[PDB]
Amino acid sequence: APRKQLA
Amino acid sequence: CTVQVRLELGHRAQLRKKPTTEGFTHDWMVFVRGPEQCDIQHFVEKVVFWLHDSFPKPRRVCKEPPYKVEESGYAGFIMPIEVHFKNKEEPRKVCFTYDLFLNLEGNPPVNHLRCEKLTFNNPTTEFRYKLLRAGGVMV
């Protein structure tokens, strides 16, 4: 499931 | 005295039938509420939902029930949730870190529930009443 990148 | 109140945090998510023009694949909803029969509004001033900086106006405030945010997006993230109390002394609020995770295409919709417990030692008379009206119990 896509997740918003932290870096 | 010592008073305990329960909070329920949770969220739903599912694939949209049609991606938005921006390419947002999912609809989701996050909430803070009381367990059945508990109106937390008696002791909760407001709930602040801190969305990812990729959202415009990411700081979302509910000053009254339902304490929730309904949105569309393409990815899950960690969402700070501050619950502010109708209290004149500390603690004035508590901050949860909530995992807003989405379902992968083909898998069932997300329907997640999370139960939290808050303990208040020696609240003022005024605040004790508010906590008890919200379904708080002395411990």
Side-chain angles (χ1 to χ4, degrees):
Chain A
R3 257 200 163 297
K4 322 217 135 168
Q5 293 180 41
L6 293 162
Chain B
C1 63
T2 303
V3 186
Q4 170 178 111
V5 287
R6 281 176 291 133
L7 289 176
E8 286 186 353
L9 287 65
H11 86 282
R12 298 181 221 293
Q14 56 191 324
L15 278 297
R16 297 172 64 75
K17 287 140 200 309
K18 184 77 113 184
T20 72
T21 54
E22 306 94 342
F24 304 160
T25 56
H26 294 73
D27 299 320
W28 54 256
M29 180 272 304
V30 179
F31 63 84
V32 175
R33 77 196 182 190
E36 194 164 48
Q37 279 180 316
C38 297
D39 191 12
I40 62 171
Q41 181 178 16
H42 288 289
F43 81 94
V44 172
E45 178 193 293
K46 62 188 182 192
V47 180
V48 182
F49 295 89
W50 294 90
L51 278 57
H52 195 261
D53 48 15
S54 59
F55 284 85
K57 286 200 275 271
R59 182 176 180 288
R60 303 299 181 74
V61 184
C62 302
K63 288 179 175 183
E64 259 135 50
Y67 309 97
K68 67 175 193 176
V69 179
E70 290 164 319
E71 266 292 353
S72 295
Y74 56 94
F77 59 95
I78 293 291
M79 178 190 292
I81 303 176
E82 299 184 310
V83 183
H84 293 252
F85 308 132
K86 291 173 169 176
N87 191 3
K88 312 278 270 163
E89 71 187 14
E90 293 165 356
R92 295 273 13 263
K93 69 204 183 84
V94 65
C95 187
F96 305 102
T97 64
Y98 192 84
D99 184 3
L100 177 63
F101 64 93
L102 310 180
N103 61 324
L104 194 55
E105 185 180 355
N107 292 353
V110 179
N111 189 23
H112 187 89
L113 187 67
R114 170 178 166 179
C115 312
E116 291 287 351
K117 275 215 188 165
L118 296 176
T119 299
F120 292 95
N121 305 117
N122 308 125
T124 65
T125 302
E126 175 153 356
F127 190 49
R128 174 164 71 245
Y129 284 142
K130 290 186 169 65
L131 291 165
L132 294 170
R133 285 170 210 126
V137 301
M138 238 83 52
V139 290

